[PDB]
């Protein structure tokens, strides 16, 4: 039913499932905006496919040819099925709009499924190629941040009663390499191109005259070519073509609204803001150097992933509340850190 399709595709965790494995425990591995874009671009065409053939919206068979009254039920059924299979056969049918509109009307669900698969492909390539590496690197970075926070609080407590910036060096090294950012931009660009092509197709499909679904059909090949009792042609109409056009314009609207989001996503350096690591600069055990901005490198992408999935880090949360309290400046950062006692 329509409501069942809605529950499956919008109100359920459709493509929102976290990786089912212990390797990525709590790691999104995909930005929220990218996940939203993929979920829409994939589950919208599927939802429209399901809707267009819902038991309520669908009168019945997808084509009716209006055989003569003399024709029996199965003769008329032969006519309808023959014309359905003959939309491909150009000789059999003669339609003013041509045969491409008939092909599109017959295979619209296939085309929507193709667009959905093509849009799901780049996210899958990301999740299967560049996701494990970033997952491992980000897990190491979070562990290093937790360890340095613990060491700093232990030092502060000892004072009240190595020291090498490994994480900073690793981030600096990531500043050079750009394979991950190149893959990310390539997959986003392919998604954008697929969306644009889908928009072109949907606009063309919705621009039809709405009468191209009606085509003339001739069961006059073979032994029936010279038969007399059979009329030379029939009036066939492809039902649900109006529904297809409505859903196609809906998908076109959604995709044109979505494309600016993908374009904004492509410009990762601009998105790289609100320095996540700036909060850690007040730790004595952490060097006061952010050095993450203004670069078409994997460093900006790692900064984005950190700003996305750093809320799960207790040390980061503690430092963030310390920073927020520092806005008033009533107290002292080391005193607040010592009082917090948030090692684990």
Ligand X SMILES: CCCCCCCCCCCCCCCCCCCC(=O)O[C@H](COC(=O)CCCCCCCCCCCCCC)COP(=O)(O)OCCN
Ligand Y SMILES: *[C@@H]1O[C@H](CO)[C@@H](O)[C@H](O)[C@H]1NC(C)=O
Number of residues interacting with ligand Y: please give it, by CB under 6 A: 4
Please state the closest distance from residue 232 (CB atom) to ligand X, in A. Answer: 21
Q: Where are the alpha helices (DSSP H) in 95-178?
A: 100-129, 131-160, 166-176
Please state the closest distance from residue 227 (CB atom) to ligand CLR, in A. Answer: 31
Contact stretch for its own copies (CB under 8 A) within 81-89, 196-204, 262-270, 279-287:
81-89
Question: Which of the choices ligand Y, its own copies, ligand CLR, none does residue 97 contact, using the CB cut-off of 5 to 8 A by kind?
Answer: none
Please state the closest distance from residue 44 (CB atom) to ligand X, in A. Answer: 9
Q: Which of 271, 250, 308, 259 is nearest to 37 (CA)?
A: 259
For its own copies, which is the closer residue by CB, 138 or 192?
A: 138
For its own copies, which is the closer residue by CB, 184 or 316?
A: 316
Question: Phi first, then psi: what are they for 19, rounded to 5°?
Answer: -55, 125
Within 204-233, which residues bind ligand CLR (CB under 6 A)?
204, 207
DSSP bridge pairs for 279: none
Within 180-239, which residues bind ligand Y (CB under 6 A)?
222-223, 225-226
Q: What is the DSSP string of 116-136?
A: HHHHHHHHHHHHHHTHHHHHH
Give the interface with ligand X as residue ranges (CB under 6 A): 98-100, 103, 107, 110-111, 113-114, 201, 246, 250
- CB 138, CB 309: distance < 8 Å: yes
Say which residue the tokens 């032969």 belong to.
78
Produce one character per residue of 217-251: b if its CB has 16 or more CB atoms within 10 Å, e if not.
bbbeeeeeeeeeebbebbebbbbbbebbbebbebb
Which one of 20, 158, 226, 274 is in contact with its own copies (CB under 8 A)?
Answer: 20
For ligand CLR, which is the closer residue by CB, 26 or 98?
A: 98
274 binds its own copies (CB under 8 A): no
Which one of 85, 166, 197, 335 is in contact with ligand CLR (CB under 6 A)?
Answer: 197
Contact stretch for ligand CLR (CB under 6 A) within 70-78, 203-211, 212-220, 287-295:
203-211
Please state the closest distance from residue 98 (CB atom) to ligand X, in A. Answer: 2
For its own copies, which is the closer residue by CB, 136 or 293?
A: 136
How far apart CA 41 and CA 56 sit, in angstroms, is: 25
75 SS3 class: helix
Which one of 193, 200, 325, 335 is in contact with ligand CLR (CB under 6 A)?
Answer: 200
Within 229-268, which residues bind its own copies (CB under 8 A)?
229, 233-235, 237, 239-242, 245-246
For ligand X, which is the closer residue by CB, 103 or 270?
A: 103
Cα 35 to its chain centre, rounded Å, is 5
Contact stretch for ligand CLR (CB under 6 A) within 198-206, 238-246, 276-284, 324-332:
198-206
Q: What is the DSSP string of 222-241?
A: GGGSS-SSS-S-EEEEETTH
- CB 133, CB 184: distance < 8 Å: no
- Expressed in angstroms, the distance from the first to the final Cα of the chain is 49
Q: Where are the alpha helices (DSSP H) in 232-332?
A: 241-266, 268-271, 298-309, 314-326
Q: Which residues bind ligand Y (CB under 6 A)?
A: 222-223, 225-226
Q: Which residues bind ligand CLR (CB under 6 A)?
A: 196-197, 199-201, 203-204, 207, 256
């Amino acid at each position: 039913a329509i409501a069942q399709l809605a529950t499956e595709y919008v109100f359920s965790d459709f493509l929102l499932k976290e990786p089912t494995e212990p390797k990525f425990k709590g790691l999104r591995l995909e930005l929220a905006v990218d996940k939203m874009v993929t979920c829409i671009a994939v589950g919208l065409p599927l939802l429209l496919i399901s809707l267009a053939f819902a038991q309520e919206i669908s009168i019945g068979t997808q084509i009716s040819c209006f055989s003569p009254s003399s024709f029996s039920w199965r003769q008329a059924a032969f006519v309808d099925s023959y014309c359905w299979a003959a939309v491909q056969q150009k000789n059999s049918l003669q339609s003013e709009s041509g045969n491409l509109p008939l092909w599109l009307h017959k295979f619209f669900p296939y085309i929507l499924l193709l667009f959905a698969i093509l849009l799901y492909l780049p996210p899958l390539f990301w999740r299967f190629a560049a996701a494990p590496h970033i997952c491992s690197d980000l897990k190491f970075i979070m562990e290093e941040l937790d360890k340095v926070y613990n060491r700093a609080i232990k030092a502060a407590k000892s004072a009240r009663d190595f020291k090498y910036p490994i994480v900073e060096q690793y981030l600096k090294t990531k500043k050079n390499s750009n394979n991950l950012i190149i893959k990310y931009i390539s997959c986003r660009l392919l998604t954008l191109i697929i969306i644009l092509l889908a928009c072109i197709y949907l606009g063309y499909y919705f621009s039809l005259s709405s009468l191209s679904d009606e085509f003339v059909c001739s069961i006059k090949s073979g032994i029936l070519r010279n038969d007399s009792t059979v009329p030379d042609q029939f009036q066939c109409k492809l039902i649900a073509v109006g529904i297809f056009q409505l859903l196609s314009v809906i998908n076109l609207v959604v995709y044109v609204l979505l494309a600016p989001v993908v374009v904004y996503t492509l410009f990762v350096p601009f998105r790289q803001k609100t320095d996540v690591l700036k909060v850690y600069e007040i730790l004595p055990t952490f060097d006061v150097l952010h050095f993450k901005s203004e670069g078409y490198n994997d460093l900006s992408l790692y900064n984005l992933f950190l700003e996305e999935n750093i809320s799960e880090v207790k040390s980061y949360k503690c430092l963030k509340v310390l920073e927020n309290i520092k806005s008033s400046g009533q107290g002292i950062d080391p005193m607040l850190l010592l009082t917090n006692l948030g090692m684990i």
